[PDB]
Structures are given as structure tokens and as C-alpha cells.
């Protein structure tokens, strides 16, 4: 149950703030769980998805064990495009099929200075909570 007086649980307000979210907020909304190996390694559960990440599709027609590179994060449409997750049009040209980030698992992360900073911050806040309970 929610008790914060300044947080709305209104359905219309929560959908409007999802579908009008600005680009830097859609990034956070567009987050994917990490693999079991990555989750153990970094102590992080989810990361915002990024171009050049390698993911597994775990839901839908294209689910399986195939790992593909993230080739486009279409934040406007709330989907990512993944290598080999595609189909053909009538004229035979191949077109990418959009997958929501919540339906993939990140197997390899595209690491740079800022990404290593974000992983570190997430892992530290987690440990503060674990010691708080302990």
C-alpha cells in the first residue's frame, strides 16, 4: 500500500505520465533485468537498456536462447530493435520487430565510464539496505 500523499495512484494520471514521459525518463522506464550471471557479478538487478547491449528475448514469438546486439533504442515507441529479431515485408525487404525492454534479459553490458558509475551506485545502495535489515 502507498501512503505518500504526493504520489498519485490515479490510473489516468499514471498513464498520461507514461505516454508523455520525456526522453530522459523513458530511458529509466526502458529498463531490462540482467542475466543471472550479470546479476551475481555486479549485485544489480536491472539496468536501463542501451545501444550495443546483448540480450535474450524471453517473451513473444522471437523468444529463445539466441543473443543479439541491441541496434536501436526507439524511446518514442518504447521498443528496442535487436539483431536477427526481424521479419520480411510484402516486397521482401527485412524489417526489425520492436521488443519491449522488459521482455528481454541483458547477457552482456556495453560498459563505459558512465555505465560503470551507474552500476556502482546501484550496488552500493543495495548493500546499505542489506545492512539496514541485518
Amino acid at each position: 500500500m502507498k501512503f505518500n500523499p504526493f504520489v498519485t495512484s490515479d490510473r489516468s494520471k499514471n498513464r498520461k505520465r507514461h505516454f508523455n514521459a520525456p526522453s530522459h525518463i523513458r530511458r529509466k522506464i526502458m529498463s531490462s533485468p540482467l542475466s543471472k550471471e550479470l546479476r551475481q557479478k555486479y549485485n544489480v538487478r536491472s539496468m536501463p537498456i542501451r545501444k550495443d547491449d546483448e540480450v535474450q528475448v524471453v517473451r513473444g514469438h522471437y523468444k529463445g536462447q539466441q543473443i543479439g546486439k541491441v541496434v536501436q533504442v526507439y524511446r518514442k515507441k518504447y521498443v528496442i530493435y535487436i539483431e536477427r529479431v526481424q521479419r520480411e515485408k510484402a516486397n521482401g525487404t527485412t524489417v526489425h520487430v520492436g521488443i519491449h525492454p522488459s521482455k528481454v534479459v541483458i547477457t552482456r553490458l556495453k560498459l563505459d565510464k558512465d555505465r560503470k558509475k551507474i552500476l556502482e551506485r546501484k550496488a552500493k545502495s543495495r548493500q546499505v539496505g542489506k545492512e539496514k535489515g541485518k
Binding site: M1, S9, D10, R11
Partner: protein, 265 residues
């Protein structure tokens, strides 16, 4: 809104133009011109008797009657038949009323609360709240009321030392402070017989809060329990007693059905 239907300068054409005499929108050059207006039979008009914010939404209930209602709810909460007839799965609860030691007032983790309900055999009631969780039919979904579920046990405590935070995440559970009991919580829907779990300290304050028959309430300035109109409700035992039985005439249980009339001639 008090303006709905009235933000126009519509005027009746009057008779003679072969149309009904409803006030009509003025001007021209748009679909709206010459259409009906204002009246409650018109599209875009004003409704009949527009609702007002000074409808009397609130009701006064006498204190003596509200306390009467809290007493009936508690009396009906200690009878297995009424609690079972309220839908609560109390077929294995050791006793009714269910009183648990005061340690439970100091629980902190939700897992302790769950385990206690399992050893008190109040977990079947919770599992029935999980089975009743579903979506609500109608516009309520559009109005922040999408999920419906049945009420579970009510836990009544004397002092809160983590018990509220322990129990509040278990669906169907309602916490109540014994000194601030609510009929809306003790008789949900207006039906008596909600399953209540009592802490020992909460159970011991009841006499003070509502008074016995001999002793007036100590925590209410002037109040005592409502008196009974019938001291022995066991109608069967009254009727089968020798005193009543000796005063009766013998029953007449022979049926005298209609007699077909045969012509004597």
C-alpha cells in the same frame, strides 16, 4: 457545472415557423445554429434538476445507537454460526473469541504475522481472500476501483508496537485499536459476524470500554450495556417446558377437507 447547458444565447423562434417552440441557437453558418437548447430533452442542453453540491451527503447517528451497534457486532462475533455465515473459514480455529498473547503486539516482520495466522488456523481465511481477488465489473475500473476482494480477519490490539506494520501487507487483514472500534470495520456491509483476533490486552479493556451489566463503563463517561428484551431466547425450551405444556388445549391436527355434496334425493 452550474453553467452546463446555459452558455448560449438561444431564443425561441415562436410559433408560426412550423417547428417546436424549444429555444433555438442564434446566428448562422455552423451546424449549431437553429438547434434546440437549454431544455433537458435537447442534445447539449441542461439536465433536469442539475445536481447540487449541497445535497445532504452526511447523516447524524445517535451515540447510544452507534455504541449499540458496536455491542451487537461484538456479540455476533463470538458465535461460530454467525462468523461462519459471514464466510470466514474458522472450522479449525481453536476457540471463539480468539485471544492471543500480547507478544503479537510487538511483531515487526510480515513473516511473523503470517506464521501466527497459520498456527492459529486463521490462514485458510487469508487464502480465501486471495481466491476472491479479481477485477470489478463496471465503471469502477475507470474510477480507481479495479480490484475487489473479500474481507479477512480483523486483528484487534491494545497498543501498536509494530503489529500494524507487521500485518498491513497481508491481504484482507484489518487492524483495529480496541479503544477506537469501528462498526464499518466490525460489520462490513452491514452484516454482523466478522472474524476477529484479539490480543490479551485488548480483550481485557472491553469491560472498561463498554461496562458490564453491574458496572458502568469506566472509559466512557456515562454508558452501560443495552438491556435485553428477551432473557431466554431459546424458544424451543420455553415451549417444551412443563409449565407452558400444562396450560394448553390438546392440538387439533386432523384435516377436515371439503365434502363433496351428494344429492340425497
Amino acid at each position: 457545472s452550474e453553467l452546463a447547458g446555459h452558455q448560449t444565447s438561444a431564443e425561441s423562434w415562436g410559433t408560426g415557423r412550423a417547428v417546436a417552440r424549444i429555444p433555438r441557437v442564434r446566428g448562422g453558418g455552423t451546424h449549431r445554429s437553429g438547434q434546440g437548447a437549454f431544455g433537458n430533452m435537447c442534445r447539449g442542453g441542461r439536465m433536469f434538476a442539475p445536481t447540487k453540491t449541497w445535497r445532504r451527503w452526511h447523516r447524524r447517528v445517535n451515540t447510544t445507537q452507534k455504541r449499540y451497534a458496536i455491542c451487537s457486532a461484538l456479540a455476533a462475533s463470538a458465535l461460530p454460526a454467525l462468523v461462519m455465515s459471514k464466510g470466514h473459514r474458522i472450522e479449525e480455529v481453536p476457540e471463539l473469541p480468539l485471544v492471543v498473547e500480547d507478544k503479537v503486539e510487538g511483531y515487526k516482520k510480515t513473516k511473523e504475522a503470517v506464521l501466527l495466522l497459520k498456527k492459529l488456523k486463521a490462514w485458510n481465511d487469508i487464502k480465501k481472500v486471495y481466491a476472491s481477488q479479481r477485477m470489478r465489473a463496471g465503471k469502477g475500473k475507470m474510477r480507481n476501483r479495479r480490484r475487489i476482494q473479500r474481507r479477512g480477519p480483523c486483528v484487534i490490539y491494545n497498543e501498536d508496537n509494530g503489529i500494524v506494520k507487521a500485518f498491513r501487507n497481508i491481504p484482507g487483514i484489518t487492524l483495529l485499536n480496541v479503544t477506537k472500534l469501528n462498526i464499518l470495520k466490525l460489520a462490513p456491509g452491514g452484516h454482523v459476524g466478522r472474524f476477529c483476533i484479539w490480543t490479551e490486552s485488548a480483550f481485557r479493556k472491553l469491560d472498561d470500554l463498554y461496562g458490564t451489566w453491574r458496572k458502568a463503563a469506566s472509559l466512557k463517561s456515562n454508558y452501560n450495556l443495552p438491556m435485553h428484551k428477551m432473557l431466554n431466547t431459546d424458544l424451543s425450551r420455553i415451549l417444551k417446558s412443563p409449565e407452558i405444556q400444562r396450560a394448553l388445549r390438546a392440538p387439533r391436527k386432523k384435516i377436515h377437507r371439503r365434502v363433496l355434496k351428494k344429492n340425497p334425493l
